[PDB]
Amino acid sequence: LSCGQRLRVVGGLVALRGAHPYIAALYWGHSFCAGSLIAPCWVLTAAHCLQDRPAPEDLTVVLGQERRNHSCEPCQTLAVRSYRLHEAFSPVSYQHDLALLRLQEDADGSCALLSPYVQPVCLPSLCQVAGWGHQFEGAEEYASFLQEAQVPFLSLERCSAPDVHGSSILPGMLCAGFLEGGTDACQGDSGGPLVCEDQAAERRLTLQGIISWGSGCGDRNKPGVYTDVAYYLAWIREHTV
Ligand SMILES: O=C(NCc1cccs1)[C@@H]1CN(c2nc3cc(Cl)ccc3o2)CCN1C(=O)[C@@H](CC1CCCCC1)NC1CCCCC1
């Protein structure tokens, strides 16, 4: 497939190399974020990750990773040429929480080299959240292996009920997870993916959300909040020329 091809977090399971071939790991200083490869030279992440504005030269993007802490021969380490946060990102409400990283091309003009382990994810227009974050709130460390958990979409009417997130759910946000709790994104999953298998297009992986924020991790009535990728489609297409 052109995109969304696949080879093979609280309450998740290990996701081995090739399970999420589009997932990007972003490193700088003592900081970390995840993202999604949406094209050979582009990675979609959360804007809140880069709000302190590190220099693009201080960032490292790693594609093909399984373990966050292992050096790996087929993994691709790329420099970041530049990045663009959404111009309307609000550090107070987290509305418009999205950012694009332009990867540094080599002499020939290539960035990510596609392989069974590195593939772009499809853009939108059976769901899972993935990341290397804390496996529970209060964990002293990030997960060593990538984790994956199945979560369903929750309607805006249910996510904005007063006992859930109320008036904090704004245009551009979506919720996924369970009101019972147990399975969710957590601290350290920032910028990572919420992908769904597209039944209309051969079950290809389609990026529906970007891990943005939550009240706790896996708490009752507090599901994870994500940036609605479909809502920002024209912005992403405009800024990825
Ligand atoms: O953890 C976050 N996102 C990932 C998650 C997805 C689902 C659950 S956590 C974000 C961003 N963050 C963050 N810290 C980072 C550290 C690094 Cl190194 C990189 C990105 C980072 O993003 C710290 C605060 N935060 C939050 O979500 C705050 C709430 C926001 C709401 C809007 C206003 C600011 C606070 N609560 C978490 C609940 C779980 C435990 C931590 C607090």
Side-chain angles (χ1 to χ4, degrees), residues 31-33 48-49 92 94 137 142 185-187 190 211-214 216-217:
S31 294
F32 180 78
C33 269
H48 76 254
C49 286
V92 170
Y94 273 28
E137 191 170 16
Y142 282 62
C186 195
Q187 185 185 326
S190 289
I211 303 171
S212 177
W213 63 275
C217 308

mmCIF file of all heavy atoms in Angstrom, residues 31-33 48-49 92 94 137 142 185-187 190 211-214 216-217, ligand 1:
data_model
loop_
_atom_site.group_PDB
_atom_site.id
_atom_site.type_symbol
_atom_site.label_atom_id
_atom_site.label_comp_id
_atom_site.label_asym_id
_atom_site.label_seq_id
_atom_site.Cartn_x
_atom_site.Cartn_y
_atom_site.Cartn_z
ATOM 1 N N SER A 31 14.228 15.746 26.860
ATOM 2 C CA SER A 31 12.828 15.673 26.457
ATOM 3 C C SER A 31 12.531 14.641 25.381
ATOM 4 O O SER A 31 13.404 14.275 24.586
ATOM 5 C CB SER A 31 12.339 17.048 26.020
ATOM 6 O OG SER A 31 12.330 17.916 27.136
ATOM 7 N N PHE A 32 11.263 14.197 25.337
ATOM 8 C CA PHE A 32 10.836 13.192 24.379
ATOM 9 C C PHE A 32 9.402 13.441 23.929
ATOM 10 O O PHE A 32 8.574 13.917 24.699
ATOM 11 C CB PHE A 32 10.967 11.772 25.003
ATOM 12 C CG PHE A 32 10.555 10.646 24.088
ATOM 13 C CD1 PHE A 32 11.402 10.204 23.085
ATOM 14 C CD2 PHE A 32 9.302 10.054 24.206
ATOM 15 C CE1 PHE A 32 10.999 9.211 22.202
ATOM 16 C CE2 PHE A 32 8.906 9.052 23.330
ATOM 17 C CZ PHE A 32 9.752 8.649 22.319
ATOM 18 N N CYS A 33 9.122 13.124 22.671
ATOM 19 C CA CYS A 33 7.783 13.134 22.092
ATOM 20 C C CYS A 33 7.658 12.108 21.015
ATOM 21 O O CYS A 33 8.660 11.615 20.522
ATOM 22 C CB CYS A 33 7.336 14.520 21.625
ATOM 23 S SG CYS A 33 6.471 15.428 22.919
ATOM 24 N N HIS A 48 2.141 21.194 21.747
ATOM 25 C CA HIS A 48 2.568 21.377 23.145
ATOM 26 C C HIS A 48 3.973 20.812 23.432
ATOM 27 O O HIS A 48 4.654 21.265 24.358
ATOM 28 C CB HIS A 48 1.519 20.836 24.152
ATOM 29 C CG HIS A 48 1.481 19.334 24.289
ATOM 30 N ND1 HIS A 48 0.453 18.590 23.749
ATOM 31 C CD2 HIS A 48 2.321 18.496 24.948
ATOM 32 C CE1 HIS A 48 0.713 17.327 24.059
ATOM 33 N NE2 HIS A 48 1.824 17.222 24.782
ATOM 34 N N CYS A 49 4.404 19.807 22.646
ATOM 35 C CA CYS A 49 5.734 19.202 22.775
ATOM 36 C C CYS A 49 6.806 20.260 22.538
ATOM 37 O O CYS A 49 7.829 20.260 23.210
ATOM 38 C CB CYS A 49 5.897 18.085 21.747
ATOM 39 S SG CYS A 49 4.990 16.573 22.114
ATOM 40 N N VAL A 92 -2.977 27.331 27.102
ATOM 41 C CA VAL A 92 -3.898 27.288 28.244
ATOM 42 C C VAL A 92 -4.978 26.226 28.072
ATOM 43 O O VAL A 92 -5.207 25.431 28.976
ATOM 44 C CB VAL A 92 -4.491 28.699 28.545
ATOM 45 C CG1 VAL A 92 -5.632 28.632 29.558
ATOM 46 C CG2 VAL A 92 -3.400 29.656 29.026
ATOM 47 N N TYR A 94 -5.137 24.051 25.196
ATOM 48 C CA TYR A 94 -4.586 23.023 24.281
ATOM 49 C C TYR A 94 -5.369 22.914 22.972
ATOM 50 O O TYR A 94 -5.221 21.917 22.267
ATOM 51 C CB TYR A 94 -4.385 21.625 24.924
ATOM 52 C CG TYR A 94 -3.048 21.452 25.620
ATOM 53 C CD1 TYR A 94 -2.381 22.537 26.168
ATOM 54 C CD2 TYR A 94 -2.475 20.194 25.765
ATOM 55 C CE1 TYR A 94 -1.168 22.377 26.837
ATOM 56 C CE2 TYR A 94 -1.260 20.022 26.423
ATOM 57 C CZ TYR A 94 -0.609 21.118 26.958
ATOM 58 O OH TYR A 94 0.597 20.970 27.600
ATOM 59 N N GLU A 137 -0.243 6.216 35.805
ATOM 60 C CA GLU A 137 0.051 7.546 36.332
ATOM 61 C C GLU A 137 0.938 7.393 37.570
ATOM 62 O O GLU A 137 0.687 6.518 38.393
ATOM 63 C CB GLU A 137 -1.233 8.301 36.668
ATOM 64 C CG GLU A 137 -0.983 9.766 36.969
ATOM 65 C CD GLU A 137 -2.240 10.607 37.068
ATOM 66 O OE1 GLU A 137 -3.346 10.031 37.199
ATOM 67 O OE2 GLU A 137 -2.117 11.850 37.016
ATOM 68 N N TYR A 142 9.370 5.826 31.411
ATOM 69 C CA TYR A 142 8.711 5.579 30.140
ATOM 70 C C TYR A 142 8.814 4.077 29.845
ATOM 71 O O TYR A 142 9.781 3.430 30.265
ATOM 72 C CB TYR A 142 9.456 6.297 29.011
ATOM 73 C CG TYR A 142 9.192 7.785 28.903
ATOM 74 C CD1 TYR A 142 9.529 8.649 29.935
ATOM 75 C CD2 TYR A 142 8.692 8.339 27.733
ATOM 76 C CE1 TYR A 142 9.333 10.020 29.825
ATOM 77 C CE2 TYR A 142 8.490 9.708 27.610
ATOM 78 C CZ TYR A 142 8.817 10.548 28.658
ATOM 79 O OH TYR A 142 8.638 11.907 28.555
ATOM 80 N N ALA A 185 -4.200 6.739 26.943
ATOM 81 C CA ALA A 185 -2.883 7.332 26.805
ATOM 82 C C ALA A 185 -2.489 7.852 28.224
ATOM 83 O O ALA A 185 -3.309 7.885 29.152
ATOM 84 C CB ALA A 185 -2.932 8.477 25.808
ATOM 85 N N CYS A 186 -1.213 8.186 28.420
ATOM 86 C CA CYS A 186 -0.710 8.696 29.689
ATOM 87 C C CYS A 186 0.462 9.664 29.429
ATOM 88 O O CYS A 186 0.837 9.874 28.283
ATOM 89 C CB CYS A 186 -0.300 7.538 30.606
ATOM 90 S SG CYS A 186 -0.074 8.017 32.342
ATOM 91 N N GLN A 187 1.057 10.240 30.486
ATOM 92 C CA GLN A 187 2.229 11.116 30.393
ATOM 93 C C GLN A 187 3.364 10.450 29.589
ATOM 94 O O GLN A 187 3.658 9.286 29.811
ATOM 95 C CB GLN A 187 2.725 11.477 31.788
ATOM 96 C CG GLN A 187 3.866 12.480 31.753
ATOM 97 C CD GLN A 187 4.427 12.736 33.118
ATOM 98 O OE1 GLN A 187 3.708 12.722 34.138
ATOM 99 N NE2 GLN A 187 5.739 12.958 33.160
ATOM 100 N N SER A 190 2.538 11.996 24.472
ATOM 101 C CA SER A 190 2.329 13.228 23.746
ATOM 102 C C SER A 190 2.767 13.179 22.291
ATOM 103 O O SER A 190 3.906 12.772 21.988
ATOM 104 C CB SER A 190 3.065 14.365 24.434
ATOM 105 O OG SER A 190 2.427 14.691 25.656
ATOM 106 N N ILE A 211 -2.252 12.364 20.272
ATOM 107 C CA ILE A 211 -2.348 12.367 21.737
ATOM 108 C C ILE A 211 -2.033 13.761 22.277
ATOM 109 O O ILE A 211 -0.950 14.282 22.053
ATOM 110 C CB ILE A 211 -1.439 11.278 22.329
ATOM 111 C CG1 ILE A 211 -1.818 9.894 21.741
ATOM 112 C CG2 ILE A 211 -1.491 11.305 23.874
ATOM 113 C CD1 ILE A 211 -0.895 8.744 22.065
ATOM 114 N N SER A 212 -3.023 14.400 22.894
ATOM 115 C CA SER A 212 -2.891 15.795 23.335
ATOM 116 C C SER A 212 -2.887 15.976 24.846
ATOM 117 O O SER A 212 -1.877 16.421 25.385
ATOM 118 C CB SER A 212 -3.975 16.663 22.682
ATOM 119 O OG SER A 212 -3.935 18.015 23.131
ATOM 120 N N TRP A 213 -3.983 15.613 25.549
ATOM 121 C CA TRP A 213 -4.051 15.830 26.992
ATOM 122 C C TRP A 213 -5.093 14.959 27.662
ATOM 123 O O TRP A 213 -5.938 14.376 26.994
ATOM 124 C CB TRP A 213 -4.304 17.344 27.293
ATOM 125 C CG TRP A 213 -5.611 17.881 26.773
ATOM 126 C CD1 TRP A 213 -5.870 18.348 25.522
ATOM 127 C CD2 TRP A 213 -6.826 18.027 27.517
ATOM 128 N NE1 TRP A 213 -7.184 18.773 25.433
ATOM 129 C CE2 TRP A 213 -7.790 18.586 26.649
ATOM 130 C CE3 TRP A 213 -7.208 17.696 28.822
ATOM 131 C CZ2 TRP A 213 -9.111 18.798 27.044
ATOM 132 C CZ3 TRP A 213 -8.517 17.908 29.205
ATOM 133 C CH2 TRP A 213 -9.446 18.472 28.329
ATOM 134 N N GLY A 214 -5.045 14.890 28.979
ATOM 135 C CA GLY A 214 -6.041 14.168 29.755
ATOM 136 C C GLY A 214 -6.013 14.538 31.227
ATOM 137 O O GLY A 214 -5.062 15.169 31.700
ATOM 138 N N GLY A 216 -5.566 12.785 34.431
ATOM 139 C CA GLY A 216 -5.112 11.468 34.858
ATOM 140 C C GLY A 216 -4.842 10.531 33.685
ATOM 141 O O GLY A 216 -4.808 10.961 32.521
ATOM 142 N N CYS A 217 -4.670 9.221 33.982
ATOM 143 C CA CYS A 217 -4.425 8.175 32.981
ATOM 144 C C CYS A 217 -5.320 6.981 33.307
ATOM 145 O O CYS A 217 -5.069 6.289 34.291
ATOM 146 C CB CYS A 217 -2.959 7.741 32.970
ATOM 147 S SG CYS A 217 -1.751 9.085 32.820
HETATM 148 O O1 LIG B 1 0.581 14.734 29.447
HETATM 149 C C1 LIG B 1 0.132 15.382 28.515
HETATM 150 N N1 LIG B 1 -0.281 14.801 27.337
HETATM 151 C C2 LIG B 1 -0.205 13.361 27.181
HETATM 152 C C3 LIG B 1 -1.428 12.742 27.715
HETATM 153 C C4 LIG B 1 -2.538 12.281 27.036
HETATM 154 C C5 LIG B 1 -3.532 11.738 27.898
HETATM 155 C C6 LIG B 1 -3.164 11.785 29.224
HETATM 156 S S1 LIG B 1 -1.616 12.519 29.416
HETATM 157 C C7 LIG B 1 -0.064 16.886 28.568
HETATM 158 C C8 LIG B 1 1.219 17.592 28.150
HETATM 159 N N2 LIG B 1 2.254 17.426 29.185
HETATM 160 C C9 LIG B 1 3.529 17.145 28.809
HETATM 161 N N3 LIG B 1 4.588 16.910 29.555
HETATM 162 C C10 LIG B 1 5.593 16.686 28.656
HETATM 163 C C11 LIG B 1 6.922 16.375 28.863
HETATM 164 C C12 LIG B 1 7.698 16.207 27.736
HETATM 165 CL CL1 LIG B 1 9.379 15.793 27.951
HETATM 166 C C13 LIG B 1 7.166 16.334 26.471
HETATM 167 C C14 LIG B 1 5.843 16.626 26.231
HETATM 168 C C15 LIG B 1 5.106 16.797 27.377
HETATM 169 O O2 LIG B 1 3.784 17.102 27.471
HETATM 170 C C16 LIG B 1 1.952 17.620 30.608
HETATM 171 C C17 LIG B 1 0.491 17.959 30.826
HETATM 172 N N4 LIG B 1 -0.434 17.220 29.943
HETATM 173 C C18 LIG B 1 -1.724 16.881 30.327
HETATM 174 O O3 LIG B 1 -2.450 16.130 29.690
HETATM 175 C C19 LIG B 1 -2.219 17.436 31.639
HETATM 176 C C20 LIG B 1 -3.449 18.274 31.362
HETATM 177 C C21 LIG B 1 -3.168 19.503 30.502
HETATM 178 C C22 LIG B 1 -4.487 20.103 30.010
HETATM 179 C C23 LIG B 1 -4.333 21.410 29.250
HETATM 180 C C24 LIG B 1 -3.483 22.415 30.014
HETATM 181 C C25 LIG B 1 -2.151 21.833 30.472
HETATM 182 C C26 LIG B 1 -2.354 20.548 31.273
HETATM 183 N N5 LIG B 1 -2.625 16.285 32.516
HETATM 184 C C27 LIG B 1 -1.648 15.143 32.585
HETATM 185 C C28 LIG B 1 -2.348 13.908 33.118
HETATM 186 C C29 LIG B 1 -1.392 12.730 33.195
HETATM 187 C C30 LIG B 1 -0.193 13.035 34.069
HETATM 188 C C31 LIG B 1 0.496 14.313 33.604
HETATM 189 C C32 LIG B 1 -0.469 15.485 33.482
#
